[PDB]
Amino acid sequence: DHVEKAMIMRWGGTLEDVRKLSAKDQLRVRCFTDIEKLYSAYGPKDTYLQPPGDTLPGKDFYR
Amino acid sequence: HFLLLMFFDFFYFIFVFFFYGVFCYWFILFIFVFCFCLLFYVFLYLLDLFAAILQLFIFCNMILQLIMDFLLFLLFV
Amino acid sequence: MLLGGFVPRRFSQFNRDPCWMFFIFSVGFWLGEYPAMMIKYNARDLVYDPHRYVWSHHDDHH
Amino acid sequence: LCNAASKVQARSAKKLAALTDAGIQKTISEHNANGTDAAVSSTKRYLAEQRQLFHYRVVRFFDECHYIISGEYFAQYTKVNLIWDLRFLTKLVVLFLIGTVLGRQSIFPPIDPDSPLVEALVTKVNPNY
Amino acid sequence: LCNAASKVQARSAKKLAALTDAGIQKTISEHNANGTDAAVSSTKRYLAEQRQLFHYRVVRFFDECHYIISGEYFAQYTKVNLIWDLRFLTKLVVLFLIGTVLGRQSIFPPIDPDSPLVEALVTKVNPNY
Amino acid sequence: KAAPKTLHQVRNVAYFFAAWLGVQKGYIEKSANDRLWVEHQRKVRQQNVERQQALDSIKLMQQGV
Amino acid sequence: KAAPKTLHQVRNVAYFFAAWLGVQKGYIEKSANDRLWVEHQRKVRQQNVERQQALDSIKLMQQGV
Amino acid sequence: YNMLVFRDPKRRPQLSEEERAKVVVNQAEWPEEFKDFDPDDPYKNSPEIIKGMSSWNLFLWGVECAFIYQFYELVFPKSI
Numbered sequence A: 001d002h003v004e005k006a007m008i009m010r011w012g013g014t015l016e017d018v019r020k021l022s023a024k025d026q027l028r029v030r031c032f033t034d035i036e037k038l039y040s041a042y043g044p045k046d047t048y049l050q051p052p053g054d055t056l057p058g059k060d061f062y063r
Numbered sequence B: 001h002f003l004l005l006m007f008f009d010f011f012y013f014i015f016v017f018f019f020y021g022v023f024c025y026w027f028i029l030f031i032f033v034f035c036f037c038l039l040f041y042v043f044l045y046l047l048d049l050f051a052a053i054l055q056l057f058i059f060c061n062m063i064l065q066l067i068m069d070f071l072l073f074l075l076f077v
Numbered sequence C: 001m002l003l004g005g006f007v008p009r010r011f012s013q014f015n016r017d018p019c020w021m022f023f024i025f026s027v028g029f030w031l032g033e034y035p036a037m038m039i040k041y042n043a044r045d046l047v048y049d050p051h052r053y054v055w056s057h058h059d060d061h062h
Numbered sequence D, E: 001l002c003n004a005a006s007k008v009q010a011r012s013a014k015k016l017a018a019l020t021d022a023g024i025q026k027t028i029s030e031h032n033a034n035g036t037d038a039a040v041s042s043t044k045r046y047l048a049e050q051r052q053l054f055h056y057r058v059v060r061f062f063d064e065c066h067y068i069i070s071g072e073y074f075a076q077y078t079k080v081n082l083i084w085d086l087r088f089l090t091k092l093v094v095l096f097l098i099g100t101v102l103g104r105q106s107i108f109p110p111i112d113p114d115s116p117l118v119e120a121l122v123t124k125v126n127p128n129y
Numbered sequence F, G: 001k002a003a004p005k006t007l008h009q010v011r012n013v014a015y016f017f018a019a020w021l022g023v024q025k026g027y028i029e030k031s032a033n034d035r036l037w038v039e040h041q042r043k044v045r046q047q048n049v050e051r052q053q054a055l056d057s058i059k060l061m062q063q064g065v
Numbered sequence H: 001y002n003m004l005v006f007r008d009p010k011r012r013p014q015l016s017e018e019e020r021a022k023v024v025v026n027q028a029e030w031p032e033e034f035k036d037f038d039p040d041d042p043y044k045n046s047p048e049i050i051k052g053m054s055s056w057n058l059f060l061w062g063v064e065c066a067f068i069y070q071f072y073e074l075v076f077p078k079s080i
């Protein structure tokens, strides 16, 4: 349930948007979720905190 | 259970993402940390095993103490 | 109560009792799943999600 | 640095003396008398035997294939054979997966140019890796 | 598909019969009578011996270290020992190089960000590899 | 010559074949990905050429000969 | 117990040590390269932030409040 | 001896030294499973449950199952 929530929220906010991806892409996303789980309180905080100047999409990307 | 969960998370983190140090020149530090984690793992499990039974004992002892506070015993003659 | 039963003297004896055979199989699973995670989650071609900053559980629980 | 070495040597010597295998002790004594290495001799004997048993392996493979194909193997099928076959199937699956990973030389499938994950490749911290 | 298999089996059988080693033939005959595998038995015997000779290896290592350190090895030095030492040095160099390649997980040294070859990394045909 | 009590050699050959088939699956996957990326780079170069030609055409019109 | 006619075990240990030392050389090299690239990416992000701030400053002046 | 927290039970002696010294040991009557019986290793000669199935083989079987569990989705991924 948590894995599917992360996939839906990070890639469109809808199930159809996630299904627009390929199985390989979904595998990558799910394994990144696993990475986040394994760090949890000890991993690097750049996995969820965007450093200033980063070019990747932000929270208002789909809004 | 909070303490167990947090320690298990730390052990998973260091075991998965820092075991490569066994092949590196700082292997002794990782081996020391890993041995410490194993020791803490065993200690936590033993402590929890003892504490669960002790807590059940105390839980029943409180109820029996309530009962005993109002019991009056006669002497056979 | 841990009173008695078959107790293998060493690793090689775990195959002398079906229950300990299952136990050593399970121990193999337990210990061997960690190397697999090392290989899988420290892979060269593993890439962080580009949209990892779009949403995080930290937002939701806050 | 020297005390530790002496302690390790003494422990291994005690363990070597402890074992009660007549053949192992006899070989150790003979090699100590001659000054040669028993372990290396064992390795060379093993490799020689395997070199001389290659065609025995081929003949055994064909005999086993005939035994399986003829249906005689399944006639006497038991639970132990089922356990062995399950072990065999598990090894086959794991070997297939490892072979796929080695064949594509990557743990994960490669990303296609039309995928939205290409950005991840572009934003690598270290392009060398 | 069947003629080829029969031909291969016949050739290997002829070669197996050809060898004139008493021990190998005796083992083959015994295992054929019992229906067991001689090659696998050889492997298991070898691994058992090596398991029982580990501490012998440790003791031999310490004895050889004492022999070298005491200077007795160099007292009787000959040309054959020189040949062996040259072989040893060559293996050490090749192992060091292979270890370096595996340690950096790359055949070539990685490119620094300030190098002019970074363009080469950017213009990779397949960023996945 | 009794019937074989073990099937070790057949199992070994099967292990080799399984690993080989996995290798082929991975190789096919990688080759397909490489072909896709080669085509993509070719398209990118073609688009760059077209963009350069359009820029040159606009500059030619500005030249006004 | 005669003197050893061969030095196989010492040679084996030396082989292991040589491979291990090579591994350490490679690991040190890779770690240094990774640190260099991390610093480079940090500098790139800082430059991007400064460029964005300059653009915002120019836009602010154009706003003319 | 112990295997983790599992301790091997030991039978208490019942005979006195005087009576014990008069006992004549005849291992020819003993079962083949227990000859040269050692309290520190009573199951050294005990038969295997499955012939040719080693403890290492079972451990490796579990390791392979774990690898399959973690790597199957890498070769045969499925869509949500």
Ligand SMILES: CCCCCCCCCCCCCCCCCC(=O)OC[C@H](COP(=O)([O-])OCC(O)COP(=O)([O-])OC[C@@H](COC(=O)CCCCCCCCCCCCCCCCC)OC(=O)CCCCCCCCCCCCCCCCC)OC(=O)CCCCCCCCCCCCCCCCC
Pocket (backbone or CB within 6 Å): C010, C011, C012, C027, C031, C032, C035, D102, E044, E047, H053, H054, H055, H056, H057, H059, H060, H063
């Ligand atoms: C006392 C306590 C006991 C446990 C208590 C409960 C649990 C408590 C928690 C902790 C438990 C620790 C783990 C249990 C112990 C395991 C080790 C052991 O004792 O095994 C004995 C065992 C022999 O016992 P046996 O029952 O007499 O076996 C008979 C023969 O083996 C013959 O067997 P067979 O007849 O079945 O033969 C089957 C077949 C099968 O043989 C094989 O398949 C050989 C294995 C090949 C490798 C495959 C995977 C190996 C597993 C690695 C990952 C392990 C992860 C988990 C480890 C956790 C350790 C803590 O063999 C062959 O055909 C011969 C092999 C020839 C091939 C050799 C070349 C291999 C190349 C591999 C290529 C792949 C490499 C990677 C890169 C590839 C890139 C392309 O010894 C070994 O075989 C050891 C070899 C491997 C050593 C390293 C293994 C991992 C690390 C173990 C550390 C343990 C620490 C314990 C400390 C104790 C201090 C007091």
Ligand SMILES: CCCCCCCCCCCCCCCCCC(=O)OC[C@H](COP(=O)([O-])OCC(O)COP(=O)([O-])OC[C@@H](COC(=O)CCCCCCCCCCCCCCCCC)OC(=O)CCCCCCCCCCCCCCCCC)OC(=O)CCCCCCCCCCCCCCCCC
Pocket (backbone or CB within 6 Å): B022, B023, B027, D039, D040, D041, D043, D044, E091, E094, E095, E098, E099, E101, E102, E105, E106, E107, G008, G011, G012, G013, G015, G016, G019, G020, G023
């Ligand atoms: C990206 C792609 C790149 C590709 C690059 C190119 C690839 C290669 C292409 C071809 C290149 C040309 C050919 C070169 C061949 C070279 C190899 C060769 O011929 O080997 C035969 C050669 C023996 O030949 P020989 O002298 O003619 O033997 C005569 C008799 O046959 C003797 O018979 P035997 O009865 O003796 O038979 C057993 C013998 C033979 O066994 C073998 O044949 C082994 C396998 C041979 C191939 C090995 C290739 C190695 C390449 C690098 C690593 C790759 C992975 C290898 C995986 C091996 C798995 C077993 O076993 C050994 O050799 C044992 C070696 C290990 C000794 C372990 C001792 C450790 C003691 C540590 C004590 C520390 C105390 C510190 C206290 C400090 C206090 C302050 O053996 C070796 O060279 C062994 C090398 C082992 C290197 C292992 C390095 C592992 C990584 C470092 C360790 C990291 C983890 C542990 C850290 C712990 C903290 C310290």
Ligand SMILES: CCCCCCCCCCCCCCCCCC(=O)OC[C@H](COP(=O)([O-])OCC(O)COP(=O)([O-])OC[C@@H](COC(=O)CCCCCCCCCCCCCCCCC)OC(=O)CCCCCCCCCCCCCCCCC)OC(=O)CCCCCCCCCCCCCCCCC
Pocket (backbone or CB within 6 Å): C039, D091, D094, D095, D098, D099, D101, D102, D105, D106, D107, E039, E040, E041, E043, E044, F008, F011, F012, F013, F015, F016, F019, F020, F023, H063, H064, H067
């Ligand atoms: C990027 C990083 C990725 C990392 C991923 C993860 C890495 C691994 C982590 C750990 C994972 C969990 C553990 C999994 C362990 C699995 C392995 C294992 O346990 O092995 C033990 C297992 C035996 O265990 P067992 O059944 O308990 O044995 C009982 C006794 O001990 C039996 O004792 P024995 O006396 O039999 O001892 C000898 C025995 C044991 O030897 C070994 O133990 C071997 C080494 C074991 C490790 C192997 C790992 C393999 C992994 C993939 C490859 C990596 C490189 C391996 C290099 C090996 C170098 C020797 O030898 C063999 O097994 C022989 C196998 C080869 C058979 C060759 C037959 C070829 C016939 C072809 C005929 C074609 C005719 C066509 C006609 C068509 C007409 C139309 O052996 C194998 O599984 C052997 C696998 C060999 C695969 C080779 C694949 C090579 C690539 C494909 C071929 C490409 C070139 C040639 C093409 C030619 C054109 C067709």
Ligand SMILES: CCCCCCCCCCCCCCCCCC(=O)OC[C@H](COP(=O)([O-])OCC[N+](C)(C)C)OC(=O)CCCCCCCCCCCCCCCCC
Pocket (backbone or CB within 6 Å): C018, C021, C022, C025, D086, D089, D090, D093, H058, H065, H068, H069, H070, H072, H073
């Ligand atoms: C005409 C007839 C044609 C017939 C053709 C037949 C073709 C057969 C082809 C091969 C089929 C192989 C099937 C089995 C493998 C399935 C793999 C799979 O789906 O894995 C995904 C699943 C996982 O699914 P998953 O991908 O959802 O899980 C991933 C989970 N995360 C993401 C969290 C990591 O893998 C497993 O669960 C593997 C479990 C082990 C499998 C092997 C079991 C062996 C027995 C062990 C127990 C007994 C031990 C006893 C010991 C003691 C004895 C006394």
Ligand SMILES: CCCCCCCC/C=C\CCCCCCCC(=O)O[C@H](COC(=O)CCCCCCC/C=C/CCCCCCCC)COP(=O)(O)OCCN
Pocket (backbone or CB within 6 Å): B019, B020, B022, B023, B024, C035, C038, C039, C040, C042, C043, C044, C045, C046, D129, E102, E103, G023, G027
């Ligand atoms: C095809 C495989 C060939 C196998 C040859 C292996 C040779 C390796 C020799 C050197 C090893 C040490 C290198 C030190 C540096 C490693 C750094 C690292 O983590 O590398 C990962 C590669 O790491 C892995 O995938 C593997 C990690 C460790 C795997 C462990 C293997 C199995 C260990 C079994 C343990 C069981 C218990 C045994 C105890 C014995 C030792 C005490 C890739 O790094 P990057 O791509 O730059 O970063 C990716 C992030 N974007």
